[PDB]
């Protein structure tokens, strides 16, 4: 004899239906908009006669049950746990079941895997017809229930400024099953006060949102202050249910669709250099069937001191032709989609969550893929013995110095750009010949894709 209120609901995400412990189940902090259920299909058989005194009667049959629908919203709350000292988001298994179809392994390098610097999610291993399989456990007041064999259909993230960073999850399950007995003690599995304090120490505010967009075909970075946006991770999962005329049926298995990583970004038109107006004019002047943009949406902002942040990186993105949104202040919309280099390659994009992002950390996350792996920032090329010039028929094996000293990729390539008076090899042994009386240059760039420039103007002469 009791009424059940929605405010007392508690959600646990599990990968096992028995043997529930702290590594298989954790509570998911949900909000008011939580919803779940399961709909049923039916049919009416009616006789349609034409004569006088016709039969006017119907009949209903239950024929099938639809896939269970569930949805809830959670705050993006990166933090570091005391047990492992690795940055982790509380709803990490949701990210894993969204990202890959293999067993969860935070020590690995695919799907949801963490580190001493940041928590990372990449979609390099999502080529599966059935992604990682969860079981949502619902606790309303006293009664228990759960959805059997769920799959993460999508994860909506709305960049709504003057609001907190939040993600909305949606998915489907085979069947919603009400449980009379307690599966596991929610007091122990549920998050305790210490980790709650640690989490609430780190919040992501959508207002402090910087965006980094670069045209890979022209090497043009734009300065676009955002007004509002959203990006989605969608699986297009469809649940299959068998058709049996004699008995009602529930869905039996599913099949993932096409993985889409789209987005939409609204901003005001700026007349300044490399502003929104320049991007819009370039996009509507080129009129190209395909675009290669690098988009790095950085929720929570970038700062020298440690700040929480959630970052979406699209290496090779596709940007639609923008349109002007006539409001009281003129604006625009930059709708993009992260496409892979090859269809069966994955790597459409990745995400990095942490409560400790210095600007260098997010920079090397963007250019190297991991916040811990350092990346080169600047280069000044060095000759063989501090030499400033060269004469005809003389070698010059030039070297390189890089910063920082702990960058993972310390190598560079070699090229000649301005002038035709010398040639360089893979190692850097520049070689010249006679009849070389012009000023020639030499260049070097790193192999990690940082975008670092090494230049030197050597004054090659005809000799004494």
């Amino acid at each position: 004899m009791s009424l059940q209120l929605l405010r007392n609901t508690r959600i646990f995400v599990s990968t096992v239906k028995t043997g529930h412990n702290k590594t298989n189940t954790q509570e998911i902090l949900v909000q008011d908009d939580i919803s779940w259920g399961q709909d049923s299909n039916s049919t009416d058989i009616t006789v349609n006669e034409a004569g006088p005194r016709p039969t006017r009667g119907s009949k209903r049959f239950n024929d099938s049950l639809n896939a269970a629908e569930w949805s809830f919203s959670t705050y993006i709350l990166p933090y570091k746990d005391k047990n492992t000292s690795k940055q982790i988001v509380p709803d990490y298994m949701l990210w894993h079941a969204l990202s890959s179809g293999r067993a969860i392994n935070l020590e690995g390098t695919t799907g949801a895997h963490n580190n001493a610097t940041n928590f990372m999610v990449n979609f390099k291993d999502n080529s599966y017809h059935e992604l990682a399989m969860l079981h949502i456990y619902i606790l309303t007041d006293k009664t228990w229930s759960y959805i059997d064999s769920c799959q993460i259909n999508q994860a909506e993230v709305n960049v709504d400024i003057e609001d907190i960073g939040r993600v909305t999850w949606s998915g489907n399950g085979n069947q919603l099953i009400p449980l009379d007995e307690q599966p596991f003690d929610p007091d122990q599995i549920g998050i305790d006060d210490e980790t709650y304090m640690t989490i609430q120490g780190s919040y992501i505010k959508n207002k402090l949102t910087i965006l980094k967009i670069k045209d890979m075909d022209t090497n043009k970075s734009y300065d676009i202050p955002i007004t509002g946006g959203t990006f989605t991770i969608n699986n297009n999962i469809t649940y299959l249910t068998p058709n049996v005329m004699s008995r009602v049926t529930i869905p039996i298995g599913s099949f993932t669709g096409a993985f889409e990583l789209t987005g939409s970004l609204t901003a005001y038109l700026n007349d300044k250099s490399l502003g929104s107006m320049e991007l819009y004019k370039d996009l509507i002047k080129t009129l190209k069937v395909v675009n290669r943009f690098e988009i790095a949406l950085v929720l929570g902002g970038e700062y020298d001191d440690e700040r929480p942040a959630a970052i979406l990186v699209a290496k090779q993105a596709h940007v639609n032709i923008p349109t002007i949104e006539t409001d009281d202040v003129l604006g625009t919309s930059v709708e993009f989609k992260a496409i892979p280099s090859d269809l069966d390659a994955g790597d459409e994009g990745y995400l990095g969550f942490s409560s400790k992002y210095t600007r260098t950390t997010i920079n090397n996350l963007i250019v190297n893929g991991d916040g811990a792996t350092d990346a080169v920032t600047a280069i000044t090329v060095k000759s063989a013995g501090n030499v400033t010039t060269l004469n005809r028929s003389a070698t010059l094996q030039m070297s390189v110095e890089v910063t920082p000293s702990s960058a993972r990729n310390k190598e560079v390539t070699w090229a000649i750009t301005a002038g035709d008076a010398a040639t360089i090899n893979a190692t850097g042994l520049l070689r010249a010949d006679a009849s070389k009386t012009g000023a020639v240059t030499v260049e070097a760039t790193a192999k990690d894709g940082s975008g670092v420039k090494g230049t030197k103007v050597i004054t090659v002469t005809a000799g004494g």
Partner: protein, 140 residues
């Protein structure tokens, strides 16, 4: 009038010597039917190299050993020893492909046949081109 097929992709086997032989045959279409006579490979040498990329400054993975088997029958063999196969296997890309984890991309290769002599013109000719793949083996 038909097309040529200069682009050929080779697949080598790890821990096993790779041997490819090419036959050059003279052809003609006339009143009498197609007359074919083997091309006499005298002063004809081959030379092939493999790099991990097309772009300038690419690392040279290895180079092919060239030999002429039979000049009268116009047969030349282009191959590499097992040690070169291991060298290329070490330098191959680590990215695997599902449905066949064996094959990995090793790089690009070219073959030039040339005839160098005092009376001969300094003429080279890129007979083929393409990419080199590796079938990883476990034995040895």
């Amino acid at each position: 009038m038909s097309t040529e097929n200069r682009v050929i992709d080779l697949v080598v086997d790890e821990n096993v010597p790779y041997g490819l032989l090419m036959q050059f045959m003279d052809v003609d279409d006339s009143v009498y039917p197609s007359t074919s006579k083997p091309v006499d490979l005298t002063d004809f040498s081959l030379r092939g190299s493999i790099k991990s990329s097309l772009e300038d400054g690419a690392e040279t993975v290895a180079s092919f050993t060239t030999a002429i088997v039979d000049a009268a029958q116009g047969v030349a063999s282009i191959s590499l020893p097992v040690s070169a196969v291991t060298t290329i296997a070490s330098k191959a890309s680590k990215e695997r492909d599902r449905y066949n984890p064996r094959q990995r991309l090793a790089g690009y290769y070219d073959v030039i046949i040339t005839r160098t002599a005092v009376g001969s013109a300094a003429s080279s000719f890129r007979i083929m081109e393409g990419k080199v793949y590796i079938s990883d083996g476990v034995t040895q």
